[PDB]
Design a protein around this nucleic acid. Structure first.
Ligand SMILES: [K+]
Ligand SMILES: [K+]
Ligand SMILES: [Mg+2]
Ligand SMILES: [Mg+2]
Ligand SMILES: [Mg+2]
Ligand SMILES: [Mg+2]
Ligand SMILES: [Mg+2]
Ligand SMILES: [Mg+2]
Ligand SMILES: [Mg+2]
Ligand SMILES: [Mg+2]
Ligand SMILES: [Mg+2]
Ligand SMILES: [Mg+2]
Ligand SMILES: [Mg+2]
Ligand SMILES: [Mg+2]
Ligand SMILES: [Mg+2]
Ligand SMILES: [Mg+2]
Ligand SMILES: [Mg+2]
Ligand SMILES: [Mg+2]
Ligand SMILES: [Mg+2]
Ligand SMILES: [Mg+2]
Ligand SMILES: [Mg+2]
Ligand SMILES: [Mg+2]
Ligand SMILES: [Mg+2]
Ligand SMILES: [Mg+2]
Ligand SMILES: [Mg+2]
Ligand SMILES: [Mg+2]
Ligand SMILES: [Mg+2]
Ligand SMILES: [Mg+2]
Ligand SMILES: [Mg+2]
Ligand SMILES: [Mg+2]
Ligand SMILES: [Mg+2]
Ligand SMILES: [Mg+2]
Ligand SMILES: [Mg+2]
Ligand SMILES: [Mg+2]
Ligand SMILES: [Mg+2]
Ligand SMILES: [Mg+2]
Ligand SMILES: [Mg+2]
Ligand SMILES: [Mg+2]
Ligand SMILES: [Mg+2]
Ligand SMILES: [Mg+2]
Ligand SMILES: [Mg+2]
Ligand SMILES: [Mg+2]
Ligand SMILES: [Mg+2]
Ligand SMILES: [Mg+2]
Ligand SMILES: [Mg+2]
Ligand SMILES: [Mg+2]
Ligand SMILES: [Mg+2]
Ligand SMILES: [Mg+2]
Ligand SMILES: [Mg+2]
Ligand SMILES: [Mg+2]
Ligand SMILES: [Mg+2]
Ligand SMILES: [Mg+2]
Ligand SMILES: [Mg+2]
Ligand SMILES: [Mg+2]
Ligand SMILES: [Mg+2]
Ligand SMILES: [Mg+2]
Ligand SMILES: [Mg+2]
Ligand SMILES: [Mg+2]
Ligand SMILES: [Mg+2]
Ligand SMILES: [Mg+2]
Ligand SMILES: [Mg+2]
Ligand SMILES: [Mg+2]
Ligand SMILES: [Mg+2]
Ligand SMILES: [Mg+2]
Ligand SMILES: [Mg+2]
Ligand SMILES: [Mg+2]
Ligand SMILES: [Mg+2]
Ligand SMILES: [Mg+2]
Ligand SMILES: [Mg+2]
Ligand SMILES: [Mg+2]
Ligand SMILES: [Mg+2]
Ligand SMILES: [Mg+2]
Ligand SMILES: [Mg+2]
Ligand SMILES: [Mg+2]
Ligand SMILES: [Mg+2]
Ligand SMILES: [Mg+2]
Ligand SMILES: [Mg+2]
Ligand SMILES: [Mg+2]
Ligand SMILES: [Mg+2]
Ligand SMILES: [Mg+2]
Ligand SMILES: [Mg+2]
Ligand SMILES: [Mg+2]
Ligand SMILES: [Mg+2]
Ligand SMILES: [Mg+2]
Ligand SMILES: [Mg+2]
Ligand SMILES: [Mg+2]
Ligand SMILES: [Mg+2]
Ligand SMILES: [Mg+2]
Ligand SMILES: [Mg+2]
Ligand SMILES: [Mg+2]
Ligand SMILES: [Mg+2]
Ligand SMILES: [Mg+2]
Ligand SMILES: [Mg+2]
Ligand SMILES: [Mg+2]
Ligand SMILES: [Mg+2]
Ligand SMILES: [Mg+2]
Ligand SMILES: [Mg+2]
Ligand SMILES: [Mg+2]
Ligand SMILES: [Mg+2]
Ligand SMILES: [Mg+2]
Ligand SMILES: [Mg+2]
Ligand SMILES: [Mg+2]
Ligand SMILES: [Mg+2]
Ligand SMILES: [Mg+2]
Ligand SMILES: [Mg+2]
Ligand SMILES: [Mg+2]
Ligand SMILES: [Mg+2]
Ligand SMILES: [Mg+2]
Ligand SMILES: [Mg+2]
Ligand SMILES: [Mg+2]
Ligand SMILES: [Mg+2]
Ligand SMILES: [Mg+2]
Ligand SMILES: [Mg+2]
Ligand SMILES: [Mg+2]
Ligand SMILES: [Mg+2]
Ligand SMILES: [Mg+2]
Ligand SMILES: [Mg+2]
Ligand SMILES: [Mg+2]
Ligand SMILES: [Mg+2]
Ligand SMILES: [Mg+2]
Ligand SMILES: [Mg+2]
Ligand SMILES: [Mg+2]
Ligand SMILES: [Mg+2]
Ligand SMILES: [Mg+2]
Ligand SMILES: [Mg+2]
Ligand SMILES: [Mg+2]
Ligand SMILES: [Mg+2]
Ligand SMILES: [Mg+2]
Ligand SMILES: [Mg+2]
Ligand SMILES: [Mg+2]
Ligand SMILES: [Mg+2]
Ligand SMILES: [Mg+2]
Ligand SMILES: [Mg+2]
Ligand SMILES: [Mg+2]
Ligand SMILES: [Mg+2]
Ligand SMILES: [Mg+2]
Ligand SMILES: [Mg+2]
Ligand SMILES: [Mg+2]
Ligand SMILES: [Mg+2]
Ligand SMILES: [Mg+2]
Ligand SMILES: [Mg+2]
Ligand SMILES: [Mg+2]
Ligand SMILES: [Mg+2]
Ligand SMILES: [Mg+2]
Ligand SMILES: [Mg+2]
Ligand SMILES: [Mg+2]
Ligand SMILES: [Mg+2]
Ligand SMILES: [Mg+2]
Ligand SMILES: [Mg+2]
Ligand SMILES: [Mg+2]
Ligand SMILES: [Mg+2]
Ligand SMILES: [Mg+2]
Ligand SMILES: [Mg+2]
Ligand SMILES: [Mg+2]
Ligand SMILES: [Mg+2]
Ligand SMILES: [Mg+2]
Ligand SMILES: [Mg+2]
Ligand SMILES: [Mg+2]
Ligand SMILES: [Mg+2]
Ligand SMILES: [Mg+2]
Ligand SMILES: [Mg+2]
Ligand SMILES: [Mg+2]
Ligand SMILES: [Mg+2]
Ligand SMILES: [Mg+2]
Ligand SMILES: [Mg+2]
Ligand SMILES: [Mg+2]
Ligand SMILES: [Mg+2]
Ligand SMILES: [Mg+2]
Ligand SMILES: [Mg+2]
Ligand SMILES: [Mg+2]
Ligand SMILES: [Mg+2]
Ligand SMILES: [Mg+2]
Ligand SMILES: [Mg+2]
Ligand SMILES: [Mg+2]
Ligand SMILES: [Mg+2]
Ligand SMILES: [Mg+2]
Lengths: 200, 115, 64, 143
RNA sequence: UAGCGGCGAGCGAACGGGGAGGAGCCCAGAGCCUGAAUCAGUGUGUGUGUUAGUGGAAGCGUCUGGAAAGGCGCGCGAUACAGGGUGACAGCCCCGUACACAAAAAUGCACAUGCUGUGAGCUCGAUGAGUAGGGCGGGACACGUGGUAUCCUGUCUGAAUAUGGGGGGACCAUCCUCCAAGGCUAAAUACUCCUGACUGACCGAUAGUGAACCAGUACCGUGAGGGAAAGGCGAAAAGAACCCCGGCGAGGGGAGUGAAAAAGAACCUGAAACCGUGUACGUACAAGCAGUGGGAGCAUGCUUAGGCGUGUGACUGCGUACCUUUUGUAUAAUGGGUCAGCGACUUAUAUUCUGUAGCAAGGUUAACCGAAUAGGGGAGCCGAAGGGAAACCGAGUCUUAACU
């Protein structure tokens, strides 16, 4: 069960979804793939083709003492070439649904073992002000957190932009890298219920 | 991710040119020439660890053969004299004794004269 | 792009259950009267490709 | 687990061959492709089924048979994947909606793949002699 | 894949299915009746963008230092911690930022809408002729004339025209389906000279554009055309008043400025080749890949009354560079004057195998929507069944009249 810090209610959860062995390889794969999917990969050099210049031979094949050349654009020549020029490319590598779910199920279970996962009842600030949210995290001994919530509220989401150590994702939009990154995860009882049903 | 390679190359050349320190002309100054010198130095060095053990044996043998002939016995008969008396002492020390303690050495030549 | 099958190879080989390929025997098109019937009988059924020339077949038709 | 403390399984990653990088590399100078000849050359290597100019196997052998138009549009329904439709009625259009056979398949056949439990009335499908025994042993009728 | 193909190399569909996006009409014209649907002038209030902009929170003392934004102590703002500047690294010094705003005038769109100017609905009909088709020669169709449908037409011909005709891959007959020989039509789609913002496991001056610099310049060519090299003082010019040597020179030494002038404009760092000056040791009877084993002496720093560590290297044993290419190279075979920088197994997609991970008689989704790499979407693909050329049969099946 998930004990709370202001109630002590026996919040029952699936023993699979929040109680697995840490499959490290799976999680590593999913987080690496996630981090790869973040790349935009916008680059190019220009091949001997794409460089500006002519296809004239600088000098004739024979007679001169020089090393037989065929182009000013050749990669062995200065200014123009680059043998294997880059091109824009999609690095987004594929991840099996079951592997992604399994990885979340894995990393989401280690937050229970490591005691990062601080499950709570209603978590919402009074008015859209960082000053308040900042003051209320000081009571809980929290600084670096991922506040996952079911009903995404403007009052909360708009009071955590400017705070660098506080991120406020929706229960639907949890991520592999995010759960691992943040020192604690303050999850709402509704969000646990949504994530339970989402991961399954 | 383009990789400049001036920092590493320089360090790699500078390492070898430090081993070529002392060599004549381009062999200390010019990497392309030094690198050969430093290899051949290593080849010769590897070789000459083998030759050192040969040269010194010769050296000792020639000291012993000299020091025994002053006492009236040739090296060939002397070593057989020592081996037939089951004396385990080596060329290194015999040659050391031959130079330093001749009055001692003489006793080995008598010890060999028995056999 | 996808690998193009060597079509001529597709028309002369067929993939069996284990992995090998059946093929029709050579020397049974013309000049049959001078051939003994025992040859022609033995050349009639389909036959398997030898392990030496299997890799050449597997290469030129990767699909089936 | 931290973002740094994660690591892959042993055996998963294997570096990759990097040719032309010194003696120690092993492969290096002639990147594992010997001395001279067509195979050493950049963009070298002969085409598929080339036996040096000798008439290739895929041409010295004779070509046989014809591809049937009918065999493309017939199926081979495994008996195990039969009780997965609508109680116990497997016409063809019902079997198609179960995603067992393709859309453009007008003839179909139920072979002895094994394992039946529920009684299935097979109407329209051509049924095998081995499967006719099983389907009727389970309780299901045919036609 | 089916096909096409010196049936070689190679070329390569369609049907069908899943998605994006969706929309229809007008002439070859008579009716009772008609400004009605419609798109059509333009005004026209409108909306709400574009071209200028306005406001826009909260820091303090000490410690090094040339300089504080840095260290340490105490605060405060945060719908603003994007970012950039400031004498080093600034949430609070500045410019911005989130956010709230703003147009006299010109314009881009989206609804009313007076209307020079425009017809629905009816009935009735008509319904595209040198045309379809053909012969001949070509070309297009995945389809190379092949049994070759279909389309286009240079050439010569030539129908029936809705009880009519075209198509269903030679062709024929039944069935089915469509209406050619006249037109029009948004969206999904392609592209970016150019404009604005933002973003990069993109480059950082031999890179990145050819061009960070007044570059398509200098320069080269009759010409078309080719086509470079060349970034950085400092925080601030405070860019060195004055004195001295010299030719009122160059250049230098002082002075001064500065944190610094081996930051003085030939200006951050300042490598290497290369060239010197000064020291130590060796070297003018000694032959050769110039080193390596051994090794005296001299010079040295140390310690200490021990010996070392270095520098050098008389004499002496051994010893013909490297790369390449080769049966084989000191080879008098190749290549390199040296240094510094750059310079060659990549990328994408398919396919097979190995490791690994997931899930396992199952596994898996593509485009696509969604906005967040989730979640849908199982169209499809691969596997769980093979034999046969094929019909077909099926744990069998082909072979054959049948097979021990
Ligand atoms: K300097
Ligand atoms: K010699
Ligand atoms: Mg593991
Ligand atoms: Mg070109
Ligand atoms: Mg030309
Ligand atoms: Mg020359
Ligand atoms: Mg370039
Ligand atoms: Mg890759
Ligand atoms: Mg860089
Ligand atoms: Mg490097
Ligand atoms: Mg020396
Ligand atoms: Mg030097
Ligand atoms: Mg010896
Ligand atoms: Mg020995
Ligand atoms: Mg002995
Ligand atoms: Mg098989
Ligand atoms: Mg035989
Ligand atoms: Mg396939
Ligand atoms: Mg390994
Ligand atoms: Mg790689
Ligand atoms: Mg190897
Ligand atoms: Mg090797
Ligand atoms: Mg290896
Ligand atoms: Mg080499
Ligand atoms: Mg070679
Ligand atoms: Mg050759
Ligand atoms: Mg070879
Ligand atoms: Mg080529
Ligand atoms: Mg090539
Ligand atoms: Mg190849
Ligand atoms: Mg299906
Ligand atoms: Mg049977
Ligand atoms: Mg031929
Ligand atoms: Mg083509
Ligand atoms: Mg092609
Ligand atoms: Mg259909
Ligand atoms: Mg559908
Ligand atoms: Mg469709
Ligand atoms: Mg649709
Ligand atoms: Mg759309
Ligand atoms: Mg739509
Ligand atoms: Mg739709
Ligand atoms: Mg619409
Ligand atoms: Mg309609
Ligand atoms: Mg219509
Ligand atoms: Mg007409
Ligand atoms: Mg507005
Ligand atoms: Mg302002
Ligand atoms: Mg302000
Ligand atoms: Mg002070
Ligand atoms: Mg003060
Ligand atoms: Mg102090
Ligand atoms: Mg002080
Ligand atoms: Mg001062
Ligand atoms: Mg201050
Ligand atoms: Mg300090
Ligand atoms: Mg405080
Ligand atoms: Mg900050
Ligand atoms: Mg500084
Ligand atoms: Mg800091
Ligand atoms: Mg501060
Ligand atoms: Mg800043
Ligand atoms: Mg601060
Ligand atoms: Mg707003
Ligand atoms: Mg106005
Ligand atoms: Mg006003
Ligand atoms: Mg106006
Ligand atoms: Mg019409
Ligand atoms: Mg007409
Ligand atoms: Mg026609
Ligand atoms: Mg015609
Ligand atoms: Mg016809
Ligand atoms: Mg026709
Ligand atoms: Mg014709
Ligand atoms: Mg004729
Ligand atoms: Mg004709
Ligand atoms: Mg014709
Ligand atoms: Mg023709
Ligand atoms: Mg053609
Ligand atoms: Mg044919
Ligand atoms: Mg024929
Ligand atoms: Mg026809
Ligand atoms: Mg009609
Ligand atoms: Mg009719
Ligand atoms: Mg009619
Ligand atoms: Mg008729
Ligand atoms: Mg008819
Ligand atoms: Mg049709
Ligand atoms: Mg047609
Ligand atoms: Mg007809
Ligand atoms: Mg037909
Ligand atoms: Mg056809
Ligand atoms: Mg057809
Ligand atoms: Mg007919
Ligand atoms: Mg018509
Ligand atoms: Mg009609
Ligand atoms: Mg027509
Ligand atoms: Mg038409
Ligand atoms: Mg026509
Ligand atoms: Mg026409
Ligand atoms: Mg028409
Ligand atoms: Mg239009
Ligand atoms: Mg439009
Ligand atoms: Mg962005
Ligand atoms: Mg970044
Ligand atoms: Mg970058
Ligand atoms: Mg840089
Ligand atoms: Mg440049
Ligand atoms: Mg530079
Ligand atoms: Mg430069
Ligand atoms: Mg250029
Ligand atoms: Mg000129
Ligand atoms: Mg410069
Ligand atoms: Mg300046
Ligand atoms: Mg500056
Ligand atoms: Mg001066
Ligand atoms: Mg004077
Ligand atoms: Mg003077
Ligand atoms: Mg003077
Ligand atoms: Mg003068
Ligand atoms: Mg004067
Ligand atoms: Mg003067
Ligand atoms: Mg002067
Ligand atoms: Mg001065
Ligand atoms: Mg001064
Ligand atoms: Mg001063
Ligand atoms: Mg300084
Ligand atoms: Mg100076
Ligand atoms: Mg000074
Ligand atoms: Mg300095
Ligand atoms: Mg100046
Ligand atoms: Mg200079
Ligand atoms: Mg300078
Ligand atoms: Mg400069
Ligand atoms: Mg600086
Ligand atoms: Mg400088
Ligand atoms: Mg200098
Ligand atoms: Mg230097
Ligand atoms: Mg001296
Ligand atoms: Mg001397
Ligand atoms: Mg001397
Ligand atoms: Mg002397
Ligand atoms: Mg002398
Ligand atoms: Mg000489
Ligand atoms: Mg000599
Ligand atoms: Mg010597
Ligand atoms: Mg002495
Ligand atoms: Mg002395
Ligand atoms: Mg020494
Ligand atoms: Mg020698
Ligand atoms: Mg010798
Ligand atoms: Mg060569
Ligand atoms: Mg070779
Ligand atoms: Mg050669
Ligand atoms: Mg030879
Ligand atoms: Mg030589
Ligand atoms: Mg030799
Ligand atoms: Mg030579
Ligand atoms: Mg010779
Ligand atoms: Mg020579
Ligand atoms: Mg020669
Ligand atoms: Mg040669
Ligand atoms: Mg060479
Ligand atoms: Mg040369
Ligand atoms: Mg490769
Ligand atoms: Mg595959
Ligand atoms: Mg396999
Ligand atoms: Mg299993
Ligand atoms: Mg499933
Ligand atoms: Mg899209
Ligand atoms: Mg659907
Ligand atoms: Mg579904
Ligand atoms: Mg489905
Ligand atoms: Mg398989
Ligand atoms: Mg049978
Ligand atoms: Mg039988």
């Amino acid at each position: 069960e998930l004990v709370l810090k202001d109630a002590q209610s026996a919040l029952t959860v699936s023993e699979t979804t929040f109680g697995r062995d840490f499959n490290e390889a799976l999680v590593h794969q999913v987080v690496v793939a996630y981090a790869a999917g973040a790349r935009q990969g916008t680059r190019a050099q220009k091949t001997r083709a794409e460089v500006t210049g002519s296809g004239k031979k600088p000098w004739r094949q024979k007679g001169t003492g020089r090393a037989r050349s065929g182009s000013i654009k050749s990669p062995i020549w200065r200014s123009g070439g680059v043998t294997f020029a880059a091109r824009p490319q999609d690095h987004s590598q594929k991840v099996n649904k079951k592997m992604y779910r399994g990885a979340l199920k894995s990393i989401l279970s280690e937050l229970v073992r490591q005691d990062r996962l601080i499950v709570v009842e209603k978590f919402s600030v009074e008015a859209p002000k960082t000053k308040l949210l900042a003051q209320k995290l000081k009571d809980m001994a929290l600084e670096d957190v991922l506040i996952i919530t079911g009903e995404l509220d403007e009052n909360l989401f708009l009071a955590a932009r400017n705070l660098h150590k506080v991120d406020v994702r929706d229960a639907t939009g949890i991520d592999p890298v995010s759960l691992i990154a943040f020192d604690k995860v303050v999850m709402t009882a509704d969000a646990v219920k949504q994530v339970e049903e989402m991961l399954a | 991710a383009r990789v400049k390679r001036g920092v590493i190359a320089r360090a790699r050349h500078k390492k070898i040119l430090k081993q070529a320190k002392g060599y004549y002309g381009a062999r200390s100054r010019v990497y392309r020439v030094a690198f050969q010198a430093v290899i051949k130095a290593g080849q010769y060095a590897y070789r000459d660890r083998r030759q050192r053990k040969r040269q010194f044996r010769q050296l000792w043998i020639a000291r012993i053969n000299a020091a025994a002939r002053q006492n009236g016995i040739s090296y060939s008969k002397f070593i057989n004299g020592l081996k037939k008396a089951s004396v385990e002492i080596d060329r290194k020390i015999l040659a050391d004794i031959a130079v330093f303690d001749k009055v001692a050495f003489t006793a080995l030549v008598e010890k060999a004269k028995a056999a | 792009p996808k690998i193009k099958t060597v079509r001529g190879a597709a028309k002369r080989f067929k993939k069996t259950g284990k992995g090998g390929f059946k093929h029709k025997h050579a020397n049974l098109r013309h000049i049959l009267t001078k051939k003994a019937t025992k040859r022609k009988r033995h050349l009639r059924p389909k036959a398997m490709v030898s392990k030496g020339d299997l890799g050449l077949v597997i290469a030129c038709l990767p699909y089936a | 687990m931290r973002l740094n403390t994660l690591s892959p399984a042993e055996g998963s990653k294997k570096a990759g061959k990097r040719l032309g990088r010194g003696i120690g590399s092993g492969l290096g100078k002639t990147g594992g492709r010997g001395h001279k000849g067509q195979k050493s050359r950049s963009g070298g290597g002969v085409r598929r089924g080339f036996e040096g100019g000798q008439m290739p196997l895929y041409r010295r052998l004779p070509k046989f048979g014809f591809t049937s138009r009918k065999a493309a549009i017939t199926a081979e329904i495994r008996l195990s994947d039969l009780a997965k439709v609508e109680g116990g009625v497997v016409d063809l259009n019902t079997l198609k909606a179960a995603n067992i056979i393709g859309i453009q398949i007008e003839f179909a056949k139920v072979i002895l793949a094994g394992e039946v439990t529920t009684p299935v009335t097979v109407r329209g499908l051509r049924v095998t002699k081995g499967a006719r025994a099983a389907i009727e042993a389970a309780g299901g009728k045919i036609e």
